[PDB]
Amino acid sequence: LFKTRCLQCHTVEKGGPHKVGPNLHGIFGRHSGQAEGYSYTDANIKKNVLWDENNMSEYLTNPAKYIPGTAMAFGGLKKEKDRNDLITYLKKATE
Numbered sequence: 692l693f694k695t696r697c698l699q700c701h702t703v704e705k706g707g708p709h710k711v712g713p714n715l716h717g718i719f720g721r722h723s724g725q726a727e728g729y730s731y732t733d734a735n736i737k738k739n740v741l742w743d744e745n746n747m748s749e750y751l752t753n754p755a756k757y758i759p760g761t762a763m764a765f766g767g768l769k770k771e772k773d774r775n776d777l778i779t780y781l782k783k784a785t786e
């Protein structure tokens with residue numbers, strides 16, 4: 692899932708040297724995009740959007756990825772239940 696869904700930017704482990712989406716590492720009592728990313732440098736962290744929830748279930752279930760209200764163009768994925776397994780994997784990795 693994560694491998695092709697949401698690998699391009701993100702990671703989950705290791706290095707986080709560069710670029711992209713830094714790794715989420717744990718979405719179960721997180722507040723915003725918070726990791727050893729730098730990158731939240733002008734929004735989300737200041738908002739402090741709590742990630743331990745129900746609205747997230749929907750927001751992550753859909754190709755939308757946003758507890759804070761909004762949007763879409765991660766971009767025509769669609770479907771089913773990729774998030775379920777992903778959040779499962781993060782549970783096993785984190786919890």
Ligand code: HEC
Binds near residue numbers: 713724725730754774
């Ligand atoms: C590359 C274009 C991305 C894809 C594909 C997905 N995400 Fe993402 N995400 C991306 C970045 C660069 C960041 C860091 C902050 C920023 O916007 O600069 C994020 C962050 C998140 C977060 C943390 C909360 C936040 O920072 O807003 C979550 C919970 C998240 N992303 C989830 C997520 C999921 C589940 C995706 C597909 C199933 C996904 N993202 C795709 C960049 C990109």
